[PDB]
């Protein structure tokens, strides 16, 4: 056989695809996460979260979900609690843009609005109070630290890595969001395949916070349009342990790369699929890692309206 | 190993999920062709079409590729022509969303609008006068007519659903568009696996060409907001012989069934994989078709902003 019961136990088995206009003698590989049943890298952690949750009694019948996200994870959420059978609800900003309003209600998603004015604060606030109203009800999943996060990537993604290149992968570049990626698959590589590879974080230029904590120097974030990336502080799901080089990269670039990635290498991904790219392309064009297979987490898929296509 | 040496090479191998709330005892079970490299059924005719035309001379370095459409297939042939350096002019009308314009730029396609006021009838003169203008630089592939368009689904879609069902379909369902789907998928289990299934073609109530064809009755198509499929005529690459069912839907009915795919399954496609499922649900509903095992395919992923989601 091979009918997955509910769309959730779809996830994975993304593909590798060699670019041609990046690195050298085709040494930078990347790994499609657009490829999934909501379309990026996250519903691999939605699908693992809800099923931690359920096995150690945590999630049950009537029991809902709460989340003060409207990203990938979010959109990741609702297509397992739609998938499975739980009501829902993710809070956000009433500033919200009416697309993601509209992605989310389709998938049965309970959209409360909080105030505009209180940010993201506002969200995770109101949130928060709807849990305190009744905690035998609501569950909160927490992708910031929860371990089945970074588990799934360590039981999944880390592996398909190893299966398709043969054991031969010797560099790992991802962007840092919860830290859930990186972690996982260089745990899977390092620890499980026992390959001691290069494990590259990849985070904004304008927010540089695992650079200055490794530094010993000031945190201090900032804005900048890399979704998805550089959450302006280090996430409990990141494990600093595992992480060998810190690179940074700028909006621009990442957004000129995903460009390229479309126009030159025919691979619809998203600005942090560019900010990706970028810095693996960086390391691929150094010597030292002349004849060193590169892969590269591409986590979204191109298909948006706001700066790029 | 298994590392695509060009996005183009990715396509397929996309995945079987068994419906909850359509069919009965789970006889319904959907293939989702959203997990493509462009995201679509198409790119894998995308991809054998030019793949095709170089085996057989017609494309060569430095010829260019031409088409009059703006869908899935000129998206499809968009992201392979990125990928293998090919040119591309797609023609398309001046009243095109600037969505799909912004779409396409991305990809590296020079954007011919036509006038307005021609309708689609005048991006495919455009095209065709394009070509006149020099016959050794620029390709038409003509997706409607092109047997390569077929030869791909004989080659993966169909023999992908054989493995992954165990040679345990019974019934496939599938939209018609150039019918390369339905043709290709069915030679492919009756003839080269010599299973005698229910191929089911299914079409828009407001233009059931298919039906009045058959029944031999005037054709007559007409306006409807099924995406992808209901052309108003029967193209080549439908093989009217292998046909053995045509089921009509009407357009609130496939939106009403994609709307429900979101909210009670968690699965995000397009109006003619709703228009696909609700053919399949009326057949699974039927005592005779009770213990037998439908597929269905799900051509497009829902990220859209118009009528849905």
């Known amino acids: 056989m091979a009918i997955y019961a509910d769309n959730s136990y779809s996830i994975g088995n993304t593909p590798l695809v060699r670019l041609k206009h990046f690195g050298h003698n085709g040494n930078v590989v990347v790994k499609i996460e657009g490829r999934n049943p909501s379309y990026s890298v996250k519903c691999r952690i939605g699908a693992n979260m809800v099923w931690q949750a359920e096995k150690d009694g945590t999630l049950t019948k009537g029991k809902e979900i709460v989340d003060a996200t409207s990203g990938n994870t979010g959109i990741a959420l609702a297509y ?10 993710l809070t956000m900003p009433e500033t919200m843009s009416l697309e ?14 909080t105030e505009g004015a209180k940010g993201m604060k506002g969200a995770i606030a109101k949130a928060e109070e709807i849990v305190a109203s009744d905690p035998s009800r609501y569950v909160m999943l927490k992708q910031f ?91 409990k799901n990141l494990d600093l342990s595992i992480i060998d080089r810190v690179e940074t990269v700028d909006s621009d670039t990442a957004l000129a790369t995903a460009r390229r990635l479309m126009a030159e290498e025919g691979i619809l991904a998203g600005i942090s699929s560019g900010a990706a790219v970028a810095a693996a392309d960086r390391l691929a064009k ?11 987490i591409l986590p979204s898929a191109g298909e948006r309206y706001l700066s790029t296509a």
């Open 80 to 89: 397992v609690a739609a998938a499975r059978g739980y009501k829902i609800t």
């Open 286 to 296: 150094l010597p030292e890692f002349a004849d060193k297979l590169i892969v590269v």
């Open 100 to 113: 993601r309003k509209r992605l989310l209600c389709g998938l049965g998603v309970n959209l409360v609005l």
């Open 145 to 235: 630290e929860n371990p089945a996060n970074p588990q799934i990537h360590r039981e999944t993604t880390g592996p398909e890595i190893w299966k398709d290149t043969d054991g031969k992968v010797d560099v790992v570049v991802a962007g840092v969001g919860t830290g859930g990626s990186i972690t996982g698959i260089s745990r899977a590589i390092k620890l499980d395949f026992g390959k001691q590879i290069t494990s590259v974080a990849v985070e904004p230029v304008e927010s540089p916070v695992i650079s200055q904590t490794l530094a010993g120097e000031e945190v201090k974030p900032g804005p900048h349009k890399i979704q998805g990336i550089g959450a302006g502080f280090i996430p």
